[PDB]
Amino acid sequence: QERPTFYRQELNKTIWEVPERYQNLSPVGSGAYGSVCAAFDTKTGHRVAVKKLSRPFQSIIHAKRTYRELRLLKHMKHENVIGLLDVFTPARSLEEFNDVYLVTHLMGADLNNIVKCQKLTDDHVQFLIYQILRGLKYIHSADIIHRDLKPSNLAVNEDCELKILDFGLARHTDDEMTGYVATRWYRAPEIMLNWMHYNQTVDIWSVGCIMAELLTGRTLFPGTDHIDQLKLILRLVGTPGAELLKKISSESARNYIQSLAQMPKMNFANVFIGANPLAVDLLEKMLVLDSDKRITAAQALAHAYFAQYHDPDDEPVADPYDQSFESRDLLIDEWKSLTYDEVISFVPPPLD
């Protein structure tokens, strides 16, 4: 219909101005460049997560980041990928347009919380990784690369359902609140130092790191610097041939590895003691340095580890996603104006 009635309050030391349909706002921590509140939605009867962007138009870099997130979120329509119930702004015109709120279904936790407060069975792992892969198939089908899969970017609820969020840039950073320390632990050797030679196969590495950690409860490669990170990896997957060692490492790192004795590949059945041998087998096809030999999201869905959940008919794909805008160099008000067109054009899901 026309414009809802708004109300105002103070959460996380800033004014939250939202439609009356959203009640009982409770802060549930930070998101990417913003922060998120749990709510009740009187329109649909569901509990929702509302994220308010934090000064979305303060600079060019940020204005473009805001556009990029809205476009992406508007496009993602899949059960295992965060998408939009609603997007709103309290402004009534472009001239007073400063704030952007985004609403999705409320998920209770992420895998970081889970892994640090309970043990998971093999059944738990089967379904959780099954979901990650299924969404990943969808995301990859659209010619999108996540780049930053890790436990904290996988949101979950009490029924053990899972959604992928917070897509990362092809960029290295040590800026505040970007999650840079943990991202390094799940990142594919080929993109540990630069983003010149990579493809979507980087996410499957990540998945492998995540799966292991769900099985054991421990971070698989918790390195302290790039040298220590590469060591820890090779120690498990064996030192590779010289051509490949140089694709996946720096001069200094390469020299460190060679100052050590050749490392053999470990048998993953001797590392992960007690594991379902199907679980080990799949890990063995994810965590390989040769990205071409890495099993893909599509294929892995058909693996026997997920026999209980696989169904090729209910594992949908995506409309490829148009990222051209990324090439434009604009001004704050220019991005902010594209961000406004997208707010106004937004159509919500049907009420079921």
Partner: peptide, 18 residues
């Protein structure tokens, strides 16, 4: 060696932390 949390042998719930 990483021993698994719950050894394999021959509807799923998760406890939310708060």
């Amino acid at each position: 060696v990483y021993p698994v949390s719950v050894p394999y042998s021959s509807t799923l719930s998760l406890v939310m932390p708060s």
